[PDB]
């Protein structure tokens, strides 16, 4: 969620993702921890026996056959962590994640109930306004010549500079907002 994906997954990335899925669906079948631990070790041994395959073309074929095997032995209803995509609590608190720019419409009688909070908020707004022009210039300066581009953003190189495009990350609502 924090890192953007690359253009393509390397062969190693695809194998390690199948390994994590395979164990997790095994855990859903086994349920009991002792049974899962037994079969988790048997599962690792199968990934190890072909760890040092240097053919590549055979390694890619071994990945194909494992993925086909995974789909047939897939658990129909795998365990999902409650806050994960498809979990029971997924997006449960989105109706409470009010963006910070809503406070700009608060009435003065509303703001007067938090005199200290709205003084600090002014400092964060002043900090944001001063840094913007430098942030834009840095991204313009650091553009590569060849068109190949990615979603990764640079850090602040100089001193007193903030990393470009930080406001929507730093000031985002809390996971448990209220």
């Amino acid at each position: 969620a924090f890192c953007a994906p690359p253009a393509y997954l390397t062969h190693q990335q695809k194998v390690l993702r199948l390994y994590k899925r395979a164990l997790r669906h095994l855990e859903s079948w086994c349920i009991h921890r002792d049974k899962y631990r037994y079969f988790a070790c048997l599962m690792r041994a199968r990934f190890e026996e072909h760890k040092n395959e240097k053919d590549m073309m055979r390694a890619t074929q071994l990945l194909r056959e494992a993925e086909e095997e995974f789909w047939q032995n897939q658990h129909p209803q795998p365990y999902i962590f409650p806050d994960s995509p498809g979990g029971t609590s997924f997006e449960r608190y989105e109706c409470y994640k009010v963006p910070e720019w809503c406070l700009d419409y608060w009435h003065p009688s509303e703001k007067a109930m938090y005199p200290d909070y709205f003084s600090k908020r002014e400092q964060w707004k002043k900090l944001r306004m001063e840094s913007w022009d430098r942030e834009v210039k840095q991204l313009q300066e650091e553009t590569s010549p060849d068109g190949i581009m990615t979603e990764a953003l640079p850090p602040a190189r100089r001193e007193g500079d903030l990393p470009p495009l930080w406001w929507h990350i730093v000031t985002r609502p809390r996971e448990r907002p209220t």
Partner: protein
């Protein structure tokens, strides 16, 4: 064994032969696609984080989609034998079918009332 895709149950990526292709022609396409996405993402974020923005962010893709599904329809319509046959069947077909359902039913109901074998017992409101 084996999974057979359907239009409403599609093929997983892990089972897709085109996900395991590493030819430099494909990898160049994949890199080119990400460059488009990354440039679009940068343009969006520069608008999004700009502290002088006072209004929402215009979305040209959404305007194109809503335009394509309304104003752009008729100029790009061509009467063809398939259009014309479909238009006539969809437009008039149900009208004719329902005419005979209601007409046939109401003719029978009147026929029974004239000759007394329609049981109107307590029906006083209509």
């Amino acid at each position: 064994s084996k999974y057979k895709p359907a239009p409403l149950a599609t093929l997983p990526s892990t089972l897709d032969p085109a996900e395991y292709d590493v030819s430099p022609e494909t990898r160049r396409a994949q890199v080119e696609r990400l460059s488009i996405r990354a440039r679009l993402k940068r343009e969006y974020l520069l608008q999004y984080n700009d502290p002088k923005r006072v209004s929402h962010i215009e979305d040209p893709a959404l305007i194109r989609w809503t335009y394509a599904r309304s104003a752009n329809i008729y100029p790009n319509f061509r009467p063809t034998p398939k259009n014309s046959l479909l238009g006539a069947v969809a437009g008039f077909g149900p009208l004719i079918f329902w005419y005979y359902v209601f007409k046939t039913d109401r003719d029978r109901k009147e026929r029974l009332i004239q000759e007394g074998k329609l049981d109107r017992k307590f029906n006083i409101s209509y």
